[PDB]
Amino acid sequence: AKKHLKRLYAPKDWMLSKLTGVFAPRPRPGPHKLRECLPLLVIIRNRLKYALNAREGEMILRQGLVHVDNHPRRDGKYPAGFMDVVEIPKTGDRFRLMYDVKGRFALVNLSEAEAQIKLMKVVNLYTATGRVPVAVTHDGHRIRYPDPHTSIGDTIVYNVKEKKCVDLIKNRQGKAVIVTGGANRGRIGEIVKVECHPGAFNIAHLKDASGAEFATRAANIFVIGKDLNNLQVTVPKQQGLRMNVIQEREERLIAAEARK
Amino acid sequence: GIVRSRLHKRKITGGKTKIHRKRMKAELGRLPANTRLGARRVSPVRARGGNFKIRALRLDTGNFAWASEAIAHRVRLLDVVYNATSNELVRTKTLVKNCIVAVDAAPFKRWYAKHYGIDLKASPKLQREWTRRRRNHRVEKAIADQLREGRVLARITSRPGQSGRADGILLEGAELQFYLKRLE
Amino acid sequence: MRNYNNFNRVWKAPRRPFEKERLDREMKLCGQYGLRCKREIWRVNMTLSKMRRTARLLLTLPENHPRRLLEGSAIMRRCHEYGFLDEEKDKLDYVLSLTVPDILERRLQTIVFKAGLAKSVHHARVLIQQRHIAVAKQIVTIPSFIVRVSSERHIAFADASPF
Amino acid sequence: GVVHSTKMHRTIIIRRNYLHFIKKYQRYQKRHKSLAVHCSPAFDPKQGDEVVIGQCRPLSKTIRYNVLEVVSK
RNA sequence: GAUCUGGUUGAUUCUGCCAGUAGUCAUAUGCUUGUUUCAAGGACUUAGCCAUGCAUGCCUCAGAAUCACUGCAGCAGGAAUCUGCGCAUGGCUCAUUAAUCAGACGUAAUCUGCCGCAAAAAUCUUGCGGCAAAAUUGGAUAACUUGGCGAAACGCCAAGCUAAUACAUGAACCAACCGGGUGUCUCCGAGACGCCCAGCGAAUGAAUGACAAAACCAAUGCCGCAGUAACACCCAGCAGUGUUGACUCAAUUCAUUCCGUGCGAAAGCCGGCUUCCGGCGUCUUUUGACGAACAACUGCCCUAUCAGCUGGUGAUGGCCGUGUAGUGGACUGCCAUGGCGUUGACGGGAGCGGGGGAUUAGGGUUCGAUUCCGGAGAGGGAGCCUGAGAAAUAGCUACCACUUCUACGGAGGGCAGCAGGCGCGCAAAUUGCCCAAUGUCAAAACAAAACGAUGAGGCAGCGAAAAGAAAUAGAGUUAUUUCAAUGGGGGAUAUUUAAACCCAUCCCGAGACAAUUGGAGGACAAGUCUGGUGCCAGCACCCGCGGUAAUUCCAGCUCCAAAAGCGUAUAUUAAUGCUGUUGCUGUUAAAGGGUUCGUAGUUGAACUGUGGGCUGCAGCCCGUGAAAGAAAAACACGGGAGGGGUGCAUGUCAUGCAUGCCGUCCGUGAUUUUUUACUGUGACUAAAGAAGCGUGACUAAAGCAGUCAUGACUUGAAUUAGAAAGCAUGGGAUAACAAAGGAGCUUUUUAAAGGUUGGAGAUUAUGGAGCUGUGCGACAAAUG
RNA sequence: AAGUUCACCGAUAUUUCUUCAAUAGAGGAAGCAAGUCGUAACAAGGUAGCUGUAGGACCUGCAGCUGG
RNA sequence: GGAAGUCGGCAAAAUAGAUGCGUAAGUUCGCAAGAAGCAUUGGCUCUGAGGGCAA
Ligand SMILES: [K+]
Ligand SMILES: [K+]
Ligand SMILES: [K+]
Ligand SMILES: [Mg+2]
Ligand SMILES: [Mg+2]
Ligand SMILES: [Mg+2]
Ligand SMILES: [Mg+2]
Ligand SMILES: [Mg+2]
Ligand SMILES: [Mg+2]
Ligand SMILES: [Mg+2]
Ligand SMILES: [Mg+2]
Ligand SMILES: [Mg+2]
Ligand SMILES: [Mg+2]
Ligand SMILES: [Mg+2]
Ligand SMILES: [Mg+2]
Ligand SMILES: [Mg+2]
Ligand SMILES: [Mg+2]
Ligand SMILES: [Mg+2]
Ligand SMILES: [Mg+2]
Ligand SMILES: [Mg+2]
Ligand SMILES: [Mg+2]
Ligand SMILES: [Mg+2]
Ligand code: NA
Ligand code: NA
Ligand code: NA
Ligand code: NA
Ligand code: NA
Ligand code: NA
Ligand code: NA
Ligand code: NA
Ligand code: NA
Ligand code: NA
Ligand code: NA
Ligand code: NA
């Protein structure tokens, strides 16, 4: 039904100025949700600064020069999302979309043999025709023969270049997770104990590396490794460590004083 | 046209609602089918989403299953004998779900003899599995009594005006005795 | 329509428009600093009021509070940068003693007068408006320019000026 | 809630009583609401008893809840 | 900044109102306005009527060209038409409406084009005259030509040509695994062979979709019962194991109809290598995402000179059905007599709802047609087609009210889209330029013969709404002459801009380029100045001036307040403890009912509790008794634990390539276990707006940028509050709800009588364990 | 394809009833703002005043109050 | 066509049974009231409801 998107109604995760135009590009249906996605036109023009306007952003995309998960995408309304690999072979830059500690979208540089895998969270399991088991991930993928020990909430390590799963990480006590929603988004913690309330939401308690304690809904956690030491994915610079605003304000004042 | 909304109904307090919006296409209804006995005649209806419904107008054939033996056969409908809503539907001979009908008993008698070797098979031959399955197996007298008469009561289990079929199941047990008392 | 630029007001007319004690006190300030109209004085009254209410709310209601360490040193940094407060004094109670003349001192028109470049406040006004004065090699034409203490020793004549 | 009337067939009326707070006067206010519930034959509640009800699909014009438990008196 | 002043008396102290005073992105009007930046703008009255013009179309290397089309040399560009997609979005308005909306939620009651990741083994076709194998399939229609009808009509007729990714038809062997039913052969029940049916999806019926100690008989496996997933050979582990809080759901097997709504390898189109290598496009099945429809947990104006409303005439519920995409009195038949209401139903009246704006010490009062979100409408009222989606209106049909052209036969219209008019009013712009930016659509990247549309949107004009910055000089000389500086203004190789504009930058130019609007008794700053008039003219928001000496009228001079602004009118906030919860009055100023009884409602007495010992440190069975017994526990689940802690065997017809060297975790059944409210934490909680972190856009109103030297700052864009309702959990002092009304109120110990056997199918006895009539030993008892 | 018959949704018109808001009218009644005829009240106001009621500026009877 | 006839609707016409719905001012609360007004009705073939005495 709806086809437009006003700029004021657009998500604040993007950085769009209210005084520049009335409209924002409406993402198409696809792998990721509208409210938790970054369209390809925003990445090319507003973040990488490769395109000065939206006319030049169409020249780059309709030539198939941008590959997402080892596949060209020529739609500027394509909804790229969490744990996605973006590669531009002409410029030789590879990125991964993650959340920083504050909660904003972050592009993390990657290298070869690391830009070949991605992590997917299982959200549903069902039996298809012929009695085959199928698992649905958080980005729309459908795996037709998962590990027999796979369960809802676990993380599957995928190989985008060759298209088979390589490993499985289970979700239970004593594991490393990253929060992907709420007020604690982008914080890397460690599962302590999960409360199970049938019919309602489940609450998970996590402790940071520094020892800070926090909680969030169980649907907002994403297992990424056995513990904080051996993570299976490169994280942004702060390593999911939230700092006090009082100290934060002080260092920037000192650093800028000596910046000149 | 016809609508299925609650805007024209009174509130539980007895008051009247002031309608301030026009009728929407999403809440429409359609006229009934009033299926009847006779030679087959159906008409398709395009429903929401592009799907199709088969509105049957006349039918005289259907699929009826013997639940005890877990079999089924295609037979011909003979008459309508009972309707719980109103006996004016029995007079008009309309076919709806859960109505009671009488179907042809000839195909079921033939399968009975071919399986259990009982006639209500020219040569016995080596085929003597009849005694193999006739043990620990009995047939109620009520079912067998009307099998030799020529017709057997059945219950319609499908919605003829929504799918265009009249499929059913044979009455047995306490359900059979319930309806045999009303019909007398 | 569909415009989201913001705007607000900066001054406020006084109640009781005919107080004798207020009328003569404002006339001393207007002629001492060379101001053009009473709207300049009423503008300073508004910013001074905003400073006081922030401190009074922050002073004792929240006690030692993360909302007191924050924007408790920011105001002092703001006050010390422009010169509205004494360096020795570093408690929020001492910002409540700020007066209108103190803020009026740290004006570009006043600073030029006390620096010896201009003989009188009215002469300083015409110099700034004539683009004969620059701060850090930048021409300034606004007599309301609040000079920061860091740029105090940077104010001089303009290179492009005949002076 | 509490059973209020059992004069129908496989249907009861329950009432919920609560206090509403008026901010201006800083005082409370007695209010109530009435719901129509379907009573299964497995239960035999009397007027004044306390019941636990759970939400289901529309079963009639007014019924949207089902009785799940009954506490004597 | 938590503030007041004048008026009732001859004076005085009160109650009480009137008047003064400040604000308003609140309008209108009058007199004035040098410069610049930023902005609202026919809502109010008439959801009144509208001439004219424009507002939605789309072609790439990649769906159909024989233009009787254009270049040159078959190539290229190709008008027009068929085909596929879109036109259900955007824009405008606020008439209706007590539901709609806000926060929070359900669909396990459902539909879903474009987009993402997936799946696919039915269907005897073709050529030849039984043999072959890369399927060389068929009919018709536009554009076009001919003849035309009509006054015209986004009006029409007939004949003749021919395309497809339009329409229709249709592919055997390559090519497997598995199952059900049945006829003739061999061995003694086993095997072989022949035949019928066995694909995705749909309807009906039947199963699966788990559980939580020995003898006897018939048939069976292995050496007589020790090993022991299951299974009569090719396969010796080719599923004994779906998900959820929960399912008649997912999925599998059997039977009948299927298919009697459906299902092509588009019988499709382009390139690169020398034949296979890619890029597109399309049908069916399934579930993510984007949506749609339905449902209701708490909140939501005034009115009693509106107290009863509904009632098989559907009102509340039940049964079987119909209809729907789906649940449902949504609807047909039958049955019962219910549902709502002084905690305000029903009726009447004014209003679209929020985020939010104004003002305010706190508590509050008031506004919200208008930029973002939701709802509704397109002159009024109905009905419908196409489509994934409409009860569509720059779609169709009919009626009513207006209205246009005509040759009188007939045919048309819908500006609450953008500009423009007429009326209406106290009240609101140009019949302008452009797709350069932001977006939408789509057969689509830009360039090359070769430029998609867009009154959405942008940007100029008009425009003292409102909001920032700022000109109308400066320094001296003896009162009257000396300097310097220039901005308005006029120009510029130029800059800006889609082109313009503005702005910035540079340069011929002064001491008329000359500021107004209200006042001068008091409130309230400022004349005892001078003429004229004489209760006349007039002033005066209130008190009050004028009757021949006017502090107030009409003028001159002087002075006062604000100043490029200043008066007047009408609404609103504050002043106002003059609506009083915080926080008002009631003897005499306004106001206690003539006196009682009484129902909803509001309010309601005390009690179940000093812990001790050695400001601290650590410990106590934390009154007294009595020392494993005594004052969440306890059975059972290997389909529970990536069966958790505390080279030698085993097999070998093995891809066995394997296998081993006391409290918790999970799920199930029994046992009695107490809420609400208040309070402390935690989770979840659109932007814009408000509070504020950083930053010299020359300052500011703003904005989120920027700063430093083939690039760095890993640049930055931090945080906070947001009614009520809902979720999890800790505490028990003050309270609430519910129940009773006080005479419906031992344990333990043995003895006695009774009523897993290899597996699968029947039969039997014993033993549990409970249940009674006995007997026995021990221990308590809050009342011998 | 046109065309018969029935059921359903139902514009429009006519008539009858309910509710809300406005409207004319000979003639009568009742208030407010700007010459004559009498003093009912204020002093014991020249009959002390006042409240309810009944009858004929007001007067009289009955019961009450002091605001005598 | 519809009282224009005539002193005057005199005389004639006109309404009409039963059942369902509906019904004004006024009032001595009994009435006014069959106020006024609107709808249905045949024939045929069927269905449902309404009882007694004998075990
Ligand atoms: K109402
Ligand atoms: K454009
Ligand atoms: K007198
Ligand atoms: Mg200069
Ligand atoms: Mg077409
Ligand atoms: Mg719209
Ligand atoms: Mg517009
Ligand atoms: Mg085949
Ligand atoms: Mg039903
Ligand atoms: Mg309101
Ligand atoms: Mg809107
Ligand atoms: Mg217009
Ligand atoms: Mg105007
Ligand atoms: Mg516009
Ligand atoms: Mg004067
Ligand atoms: Mg004075
Ligand atoms: Mg009084
Ligand atoms: Mg009248
Ligand atoms: Mg007297
Ligand atoms: Mg007549
Ligand atoms: Mg005559
Ligand atoms: Mg007569
Ligand atoms: Na200028
Ligand atoms: Na209007
Ligand atoms: Na408007
Ligand atoms: Na096709
Ligand atoms: Na509103
Ligand atoms: Na509409
Ligand atoms: Na239009
Ligand atoms: Na082009
Ligand atoms: Na401009
Ligand atoms: Na007020
Ligand atoms: Na006050
Ligand atoms: Na903001």
Coordinates of C-alpha atoms (C1' of nucleotides) and ligand atoms in Angstrom, one line a residue, chain C residues 20, chain E residues 520-527, ligand 16:
Chain C
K20 CA 11.1 55.7 38.8
Chain E
rA520 C1' 2.3 65.7 30.7
rG521 C1' -4.4 66.1 37.7
rG522 C1' -4.2 60.4 40.2
rA523 C1' -3.4 55.1 39.3
rC524 C1' 1.6 56.3 36.1
rA525 C1' 7.2 59.0 34.0
rA526 C1' 6.6 64.1 32.4
rG527 C1' 4.2 72.1 32.8
Ligands
MG16 MG 4.3 61.9 38.4

